């Protein structure tokens, strides 16, 4: 069942990427860079999850299955999602690439702490997990603080769209460390199959859902 779920996920990622490609052909004032980012996120994730479907992207460690292909996925897809969010805030204004790369750095560190925590046991595991959670808190502080202030500097209509996708992204993102802690990588309260379903459904919304809402909202700002 786990294999079939991963095949299905990869198929949905492909469909999402094809949809964003089709939107890119009639871009409605959204820069090409934002369509490229929107396409890479699901295609990379789809490839990583295909490796799990094929029985390759996992190994046995600490009497648990480490789905290491999830970290290979997230270390590329998640910094790209924050790049997408930052570029939304900066729509119609001067780009702040310092703030954008601040988020990329925090995010890559966050994913690495997750991988190291998964390979760790006892107190060491929760030290790495906690550092990752601290990185996520700083990402959320930037998202609702200085980055939202950039969105507000780009006017009422853009700031409304930004706030919507910031809440969409943030709601989904806090679910990942929650599921991690509850599942076999952490306290082992949630069953492996349950964790697998959560890390199938969440990313469908994080990777395809997010960019449908984001791109549609930006395209709507276009005065045709």
């Amino acid at each position: 069942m786990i294999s079939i779920l991963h095949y299905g996920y990869s198929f949905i990622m492909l469909l999402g990427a094809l949809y964003f490609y089709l939107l890119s052909k009639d871009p409605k004032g959204v820069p090409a860079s934002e369509y490229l980012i929107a396409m890479v996120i699901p295609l990379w994730s789809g490839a990583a999850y295909l490796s799990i479907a094929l029985g390759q992207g996992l190994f046995q460690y600490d009497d648990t299955t480490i789905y290491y292909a999830r970290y290979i996925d997230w270390v590329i897809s998640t910094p790209l999602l924050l790049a997408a969010l930052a570029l939304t805030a900066m729509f119609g204004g001067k780009k702040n690439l310092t703030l954008l790369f601040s988020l990329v750095a925090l995010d890559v560190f966050m994913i690495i702490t997750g991988f190291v925590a998964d390979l760790s046991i006892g107190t060491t595991k929760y030290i790495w997990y906690s550092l990752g959670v601290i990185a996520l808190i700083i990402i959320l502080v930037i998202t609702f603080g200085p980055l939202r202030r950039i969105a507000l500097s780009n006017g009422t209509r853009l700031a409304r769209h930004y706030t919507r996708v910031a809440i969409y992204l943030s709601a989904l993102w806090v679910c990942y460390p929650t599921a991690w802690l509850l599942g076999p990588s952490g306290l082992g309260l949630a069953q492996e199959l349950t964790e697998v379903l959560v890390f199938i459904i969440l990313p469908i919304f994080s990777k395809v859902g997010f960019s449908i809402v984001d791109l549609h909202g930006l395209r709507k700002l276009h005065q045709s």
Copy 2:
């Protein structure tokens, strides 16, 4: 013999890089970034192939995986496509989105090759096929939208671009062909033959390409 071929390769890469450095000192209207890219490609490849010469950049899996080849290509091949894109854009506005589209496709392509090499049976050919699909899209971009940019930069630039695009594309299709025929794939081609192909092809891909590319761009100065 395999060790000696790799030492010789590394020496040729070094000579190519030194030649591109010498050209960089009298640049004839070619931006410094294009000389840097032209130098990094062979120096990185030379270092990777040196590891094979020293007997380090390979492991047994029941055949030899020359993993240092993937460490080489994952850096050198995206840089080659960056060089090709910047040639198309010579004298005009840059399209960094198209450039990074090629970089993304190319890094994915090399990764599928590495995963395919570590894979067995149907799984191997699934990864190989995804890499081939990435290469086809790279070629579609190369002869489609990227060539259109070259044409927008005038007849003489477009002629040079078309020449180096065919040069790069002809060599690039050889890599997956050799991979499939050799011990990583169907095992029809002998290991020593595959080794020679993955010595001679890259000499043309990495040094040959940038000799033709830089000479052509420098000639546009007059």
Copy 3:
């Protein structure tokens, strides 16, 4: 012993990063990108050395301890330090990102040769070490040649500051390959504890000391 030194190192990196953050809030004409770089260097190094403190970032090879987390640290922190130095040379002037990325490329290669040399034995070890030393020599030639000429083009006061931080960086940097060759990774003349103390004290000056001197000097060019 070695664990405690690494915990202490990580704490100093954290304090350094917090100081650079506080300076960033009253930036005195120094671009935000230069504060971000100054903060990432110690935070990354701190995390890498924390892994050694926890007994994770090392393994046994050729009867010796390979502190591989040092290379994970340097492969990110050292290119960022050269980026910081290049941006100092370019202060108040046109950026030369080609020269900056030339240094990044040389530097990443240098650290990789160090790691490969550490995993190598006999003549092979010293071939990789020598390639690393050649990369460092080219970095120093760029630093005191073309990069210094950029600094001179940005006026007397900037060029004086650049020359000071360039000599500071270069004096510390030549110590790393020297300690490597003398310690267990090389000729094995110095004890493991001696090498550990050098690769604790040097980086405190290379990562925190350097950016105190750099940022203070740049902030001083500000007319209040």
